[PDB]
Amino acid sequence: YTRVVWCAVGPEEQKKCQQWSQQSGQNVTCATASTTDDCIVLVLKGEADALNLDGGYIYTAGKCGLVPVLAENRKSSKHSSLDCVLRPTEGYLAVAVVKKANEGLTWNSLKDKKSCHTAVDRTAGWNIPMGLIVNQTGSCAFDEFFSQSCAPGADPKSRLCALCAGDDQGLDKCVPNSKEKYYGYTGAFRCLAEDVGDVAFVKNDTVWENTNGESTADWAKNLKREDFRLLCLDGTRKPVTEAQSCHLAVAPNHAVVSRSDRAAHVEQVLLHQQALFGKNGKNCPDKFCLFKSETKNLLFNDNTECLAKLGGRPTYEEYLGTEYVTAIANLKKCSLEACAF
Ligand SMILES: *[C@@H]1O[C@H](CO)[C@@H](O[C@@H]2O[C@H](CO)[C@@H](O)[C@H](O)[C@H]2NC(C)=O)[C@H](O)[C@H]1NC(C)=O
Ligand SMILES: *[C@@H]1O[C@H](CO)[C@@H](O[C@@H]2O[C@H](CO)[C@@H](O)[C@H](O)[C@H]2NC(C)=O)[C@H](O)[C@H]1NC(C)=O
Ligand SMILES: COc1ccc2cc(CCC(C)=O)ccc2c1
Ligand SMILES: *[C@@H]1O[C@H](CO)[C@@H](O)[C@H](O)[C@H]1NC(C)=O
Ligand SMILES: [Fe+3]
Ligand SMILES: [Zn+2]
Ligand SMILES: [Zn+2]
Fold it and tell me: Fewest C-beta atoms under 10 Å: which of 9, 76, 186, 237?
C-alpha cells in the first residue's frame, strides 16, 4: 500500500538497495538499471518511483516531467536554529583540481591536457566546466579540447573515454555507473590521484574526503591535500582550503526526484526511512546506514546528513536555478523544451 520502488544505478547500488529493502521490511524495494538515464526512464514508465540525482540529471528528469522531492543536505555553518530536514540547502562548490607538482597548469593552459570527469551531463563534472570551456573557446567542439579524458557516458571508442578503465575485469569501460573505476566524484578524483588525468572536475568535498586519512581506500590512503591545487577562473592556483574563493560554480544539491503523482508518497516514506537509517537514525549504524557507502557515494552521497524538505514546492527549474538551467540549455545547443525520451 505504501511501498516505494527505488532505482539503483548499476550492481553496487543494487546491492546497497537490496540491503535497504531487507532492513526496511520491503517498505522500499529495488529496480536496477545500468545508467541514470535508464533509471529516469523506469521512473517515467512507473516501474520505479524515485532516485537521487545530480543537478544535470535533474534537468533531464525535469524536462520529462519528474519533480524534485527532497534534497541532500550535508554539514553546514549558518541556518543554526534549524533541524537538518528544515535547513535550506547551500549548494556545493564545483572545482577544478590538479596536482601541485603539475606546475604551471592553470585554467588558461587546460587545452590538450588530460581530464577526469564524474560523468557526461553531471554538474561539477561536465555541465559547469564544459559550459565554461565552450563559452571561452567560442566552439562546440568540446570533444576536441582535452587530448584524452575519462567522461563516463561518452562514446567508449572516443577520446572522451580514452582514460576510463572499466571494472576489475577491464569490462564496461566508460559506463556511467560505479563499475567504471573512474566514475563519479571519487572516481574522477582517483583518475587525478593516479595521474591518469591532469585535471579532475569534482566538488570541494571530494578533495577533503579522500585525503589526509579521510579515506582508507588503497588509492587514497596516502594522499595529502597539500599535493593538490584548485584552478581558479582568473588563472591562479590555490590550496584546496580556498574553495570558497576558487571554484567554477555553486551547484544545486543532489536531490530525490519522482513522478509528480508519486512525490507526496515518496517524501513521506523517505522522511520515515531516514529517521531509521539516516545520520542519527534509530538503526544506523547497528543495522543499516542509508548515507554510508565506504566513500563510493552509492544511492546518496556519503556526506549527506539528511534529506531536506524543499521550501516553496519548487519546479525543477526553480530548484536548479534560472542561471544553471540556461547554462545547460546553452551547452546542449552543441549536441529547447522536450523530454529526451
Ligand atoms: C570543503 O569540503 C570539506 C569537506 O566537506 C569541508 O570541511 C568540512 O567542514 C565542516 C564544517 O563545515 C567540518 O566540521 C568538517 O570537519 C570538515 N571535514 C573535513 C574532512 O575536514 C569544507 O568546509 C569545505 N570548504 C568550503 C569552502 O565549503
Ligand atoms: C555561457 O554563455 C551563455 C551565453 O552568454 C550564458 O548564457 C547566458 O547567461 C546569462 C546569465 O545567467 C543570462 O542572463 C543570458 O540570458 C544567457 N544568454 C544566452 C544567450 O542564453 C551561459 O550562462 C554561459 N555558461 C556558463 C556555464 O557560464
Ligand atoms: C542547494 O541546491 C539548491 C537548491 C535550491 C536552489 C534554488 C535556487 C533558486 C534560484 C532560482 C532561479 O530559483 C537556486 C539554487 C538552488 C540550489
Ligand atoms: C514500514 O512501514 C510501516 C508504516 O507505513 C510501518 O508500520 C513499518 O514498521 C515500517 N517498517 C520499516 C522497517 O520501515
Ligand atoms: Fe553533482
Ligand atoms: Zn562563487
Ligand atoms: Zn515556485
Answer: 76
Domain ranges, ordered by start, for the chain: 2-73+255-316, 74-254+317-327
Experimental method: X-ray
CA distance 222 to 108: 29
Strand partners, 32: 8
Q: Under 8 Å CB-to-CB from 73, ≥6 apart: which residues?
A: 84, 85, 87, 89, 253, 304, 305, 306, 307, 308
Beta bridge partners of 50: 6, 258
Residue 59 assigned to a binding site:
no
Q: How far is Cα 5 from Cα 291, in angstroms, rounded to an integer?
A: 18
Name the residue among 168, 164, 162 with its Cα closest to residue 176.
Answer: 164
List all residues 6 or more positions away from 157 whose beta carbon is below 8 Å from its beta carbon. none
The domain covering 2-73+255-316 belongs, at the CATH homologous superfamily level, to Periplasmic binding protein-like II (3.40.190.10)
